[PDB]
Design a protein around this nucleic acid. Sequence first.
DNA 1: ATTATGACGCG
DNA 2: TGCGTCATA
Length: 430
Amino acid sequence: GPHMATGQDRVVALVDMDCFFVQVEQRQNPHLRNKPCAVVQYKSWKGGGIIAVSYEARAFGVTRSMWADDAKKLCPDLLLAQVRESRGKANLTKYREASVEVMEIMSRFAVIERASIDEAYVDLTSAVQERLQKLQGQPISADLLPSTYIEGLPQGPTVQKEGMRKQGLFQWLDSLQIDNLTSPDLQLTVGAVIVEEMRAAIERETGFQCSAGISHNKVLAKLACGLNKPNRQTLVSHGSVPQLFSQMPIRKIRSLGGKLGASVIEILGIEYMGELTQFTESQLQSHFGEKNGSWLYAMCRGIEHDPVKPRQLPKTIGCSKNFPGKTALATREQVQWWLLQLAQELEERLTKDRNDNDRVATQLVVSIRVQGDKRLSSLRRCCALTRYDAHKMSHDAFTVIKNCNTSGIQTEWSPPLTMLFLCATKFSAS
DNA sequence: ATTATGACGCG
DNA sequence: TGCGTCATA
Ligand SMILES: Nc1ncnc2c1ncn2[C@H]1C[C@H](O)[C@@H](COP(=O)(O)OP(=O)(O)OP(=O)(O)O)O1
Ligand SMILES: [Ca+2]
Ligand SMILES: [Mg+2]
């Protein structure tokens, strides 16, 4: 009743760039614009591995993780842009720098949480309050929401997509109570107006298009964002949740796409997020733990409290290289050469980071994978990062892992290494 | 698929 | 103030 929290206290958006690495390459090379194209990493094995795909190429069935040779079978005219290679490895600097362009624009509107290279959460609660005070009970025009979908609408008593979008928006706006500054639906609507403005600024100032979700928390905002891609935004209201969740596979919700989500499905014998409402909080805690159980109990009702963290910069700076099949490092000299390449890239990125962001990493984390281990990581060890010097970091990394070598011969390495990973962490102000 | 980030548990 | 695992981009 009057004491039941509905999780409508915040306005949260998630902005996610459309096919991000592709847009970065299309900005740089106009010949790629408005074409089926993909970004590929390396070239020797099966034409290279695809890591990003334009919407035109997706129509042919091209996907991330596909080898380029196989993608060409589906889309013979597919254009390809290669990730830069430096010091023997893929180097992602262009995309990291493009990400900074977008994050800096978003930060003008509100505090953001960098969630990945191409997406950020925004807590718009305060910005919405401010905008509502300027509006002064003035209605919100559909013209202020030219790319917004209202999930669940139209409904009740045109066969084209834009027509449906407008119909739903009209129904939503007609029902809005602009009189009440505390109305959560109104708050979301104003949030959506702000997000249109943010998205326009991103496109004007960078050339890049994006999609966004607007809702009352991060999980719903992330879900919302994916409902209408690309180049569109979606408002998921609290009232839209029962219908939305009634046919929503559990795996679609952030954090439930893996083993936990599979366990929810198997243990409870359900398929859709909505079906979770039929269990008590204690029942859910009994299967999935105190924390997960409480989270699921609220989440299936559209309620989540995880804050948008005030963090625009990554907390770690890392680089890594796999050594597949035949290339597994079987000599000490090889292990040392690659550790040096990684350390040189790391030194370059750290030195730039220190100058830009007034901070210094204090810990170096070294991780390896050994041949035969199905685990993505076989071993992790750390040491002090006291100087931004590639030679010192590579030597320190070796020292930390050299004991992993079973080889009797001092020159050889066994068992061969299938991966090396160096990561700088534990930043302190400088 | 390879090269990344970030959270959480304490087999 | 370590390390392994999970989940995601
Ligand atoms: N598994 C991966 N390995 C390497 N790079 C990845 C991987 N997943 C994503 N990326 C990179 C390339 C992407 O352009 C960028 C952002 O990823 P993501 O948001 O998942 O898709 P996207 O931006 O390419 O398309 P979409 O329009 O569907 O968001 O990060
Ligand atoms: Ca994206
Ligand atoms: Mg993304």
